[PDB]
Design an enzyme around this catalytic site. Structure first.
Site, PDB file in Angstrom:
ATOM      1  N   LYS A 237      -1.272  -1.106   3.865  1.00  0.00           N
ATOM      2  CA  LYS A 237      -2.033  -0.108   3.121  1.00  0.00           C
ATOM      3  C   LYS A 237      -2.281  -0.586   1.681  1.00  0.00           C
ATOM      4  CE  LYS A 237      -2.251   4.133   0.921  1.00  0.00           C
ATOM      5  NZ  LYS A 237      -3.185   4.413  -0.204  1.00  0.00           N
ATOM      6  N   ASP A 256      -3.668   5.381   5.697  1.00  0.00           N
ATOM      7  CA  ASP A 256      -2.422   6.134   5.623  1.00  0.00           C
ATOM      8  C   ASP A 256      -2.590   7.411   6.450  1.00  0.00           C
ATOM      9  OD1 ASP A 256      -4.031   7.870   4.079  1.00  0.00           O
ATOM     10  OD2 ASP A 256      -2.941   7.491   2.214  1.00  0.00           O
TER      11      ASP A 256
HETATM   12  C1  LIG Z   1      -1.434   6.591  -3.710  1.00  0.00           C
HETATM   13  C2  LIG Z   1      -2.728   7.131  -4.353  1.00  0.00           C
HETATM   14  C3  LIG Z   1      -2.642   8.427  -5.133  1.00  0.00           C
HETATM   15  C4  LIG Z   1      -3.547   6.093  -5.100  1.00  0.00           C
HETATM   16  C5  LIG Z   1      -4.203   5.772  -3.775  1.00  0.00           C
HETATM   17  N1  LIG Z   1      -5.620   5.601  -3.898  1.00  0.00           N
HETATM   18  C6  LIG Z   1      -6.417   5.535  -2.697  1.00  0.00           C
HETATM   19  O1  LIG Z   1      -5.927   5.513  -1.624  1.00  0.00           O
HETATM   20  C7  LIG Z   1      -7.916   5.344  -2.823  1.00  0.00           C
HETATM   21  C8  LIG Z   1      -8.741   5.639  -3.965  1.00  0.00           C
HETATM   22  S1  LIG Z   1     -10.338   5.240  -3.563  1.00  0.00           S
HETATM   23  C9  LIG Z   1     -10.042   4.654  -2.006  1.00  0.00           C
HETATM   24  C10 LIG Z   1     -10.647   4.113  -0.868  1.00  0.00           C
HETATM   25  N2  LIG Z   1      -9.697   3.950   0.057  1.00  0.00           N
HETATM   26  C11 LIG Z   1      -8.503   4.348  -0.472  1.00  0.00           C
HETATM   27  N3  LIG Z   1      -8.730   4.777  -1.745  1.00  0.00           N
HETATM   28  C12 LIG Z   1      -3.846   7.188  -3.335  1.00  0.00           C
END
Ligand SMILES: CC1(C)CC(NC(=O)c2csc3cncn23)C1
Ligand code: NI
Length: 303
Positions: A237, A256
């Site tokens: 991830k 996730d």
């Molecule tokens: C752990 C978190 C708060 C930071 C993470 N960011 C993302 O998963 C995300 C932002 S834009 C995008 C495209 N695919 C995943 N993401 C979530």
């Protein structure tokens, strides 16, 4: 004694970049879990560090205004402006991607109508890697805190504006030192402190330094992903976040439990490591080679 600029307070120190709000909405990009280094220090004005420099960004409907703090005060240079153009990847047309995704996805069409201008930043690999190591079992506000304390404690001081002191992102050598994990635990990183120190050490000692991350930027996606997954605290991830956000792999789709929920609820998808990989393949097959950008729209729409 130096204050954060607004468009009102400092008219002579702003340049503009023609930018429809359909191509970029600052307020849906800068604190949406890609970068953790931007804050709206006054209304509609976003301040944060890019390299060894602080920027403040604001926009109208048609124009992106920026100002840089380094030197006697002056407007951004063409080069500094090109840096910002690259950071927002403004060469790529988001309106054209949105319509290509909408052609095969009605859910995206519905959800994207209100959430235009969500694009992917092109981030520094080092910053992105260590930010996402800190992102495990975490939320945006807490990650933001950890990253800021890390930069204060280990990175070079740049400038103070109002009550905010800005630091550069640390080099690997700074993060790899003998007291680094202990210091990082003092700053509240918990178990993530271990992974920060050990990944810094691994990149320096086993991979030959930060030139390795630049090599992954030019390597193919599957090779980059596999290489990142050798690092402490970097699994599939996190590796996909870094691929998408810093290594120019727009097809990378971080999976996730939240993406499972969406896929099952909104796409009717049914099939662990193997099923997570299958779900990433599903979205690539649906949206195409900018699949991770499409997912960012949905992520930023869900925020
Ligand atoms: C752990 C978190 C708060 C930071 C993470 N960011 C993302 O998963 C995300 C932002 S834009 C995008 C495209 N695919 C995943 N993401 C979530
Ligand atoms: Ni079902």
């Amino acid at each position: 004694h130096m204050r954060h600029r607004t468009l009102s307070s400092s008219p002579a120190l702003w340049a503009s970049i023609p930018c429809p709000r359909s191509e970029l909405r600052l307020d849906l990009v800068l604190a949406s879990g890609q970068s953790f280094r931007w804050k709206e220090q006054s209304p509609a004005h976003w301040s944060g560090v890019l390299a060894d420099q602080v920027w403040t960004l604001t926009q109208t409907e048609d124009q992106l205004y920026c100002t840089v703090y380094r030197s006697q005060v002056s407007r951004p240079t063409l080069e500094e402006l090109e840096t910002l153009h690259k950071y927002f990847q403004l060469d790529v047309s988001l309106a054209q991607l949105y319509s290509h995704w909408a052609s095969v996805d009605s859910h995206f069409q519905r959800v994207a109508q209100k959430f235009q201008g969500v694009r992917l930043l092109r981030q520094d690999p080092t910053e992105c890697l260590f930010s996402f190591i800190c992102s495990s079992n975490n939320n945006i506000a807490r990650i933001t805190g950890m990253v800021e304390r890390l930069c204060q404690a280990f990175g070079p001081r740049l400038i103070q504006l109002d009550d905010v002191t800005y630091h550069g992102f640390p080099n690997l050598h700074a993060l790899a030192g003998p007291e680094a994990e202990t210091h990082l635990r003092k700053l509240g990183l918990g178990y993530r402190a271990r992974y920060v120190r050990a990944s810094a050490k691994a990149i320096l000692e086993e991979q030959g330094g930060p030139a390795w991350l630049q090599q992954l930027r030019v390597a193919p996606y599957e090779e980059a992903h596999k290489a990142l997954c050798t690092l402490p605290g970097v699994g599939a991830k996190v590796a996909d976040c870094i691929c998408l956000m810093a290594l120019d792999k727009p097809q990378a789709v971080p999976v996730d439990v939240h993406v499972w929920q969406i896929a099952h609820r909104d796409y009717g998808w049914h099939p662990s490591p193997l099923a997570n990989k299958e779900l990433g393949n599903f979205f690539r097959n649906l949206w195409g080679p900018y699949a991770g950008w499409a997912q960012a729209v949905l992520f930023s729409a869900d925020l």
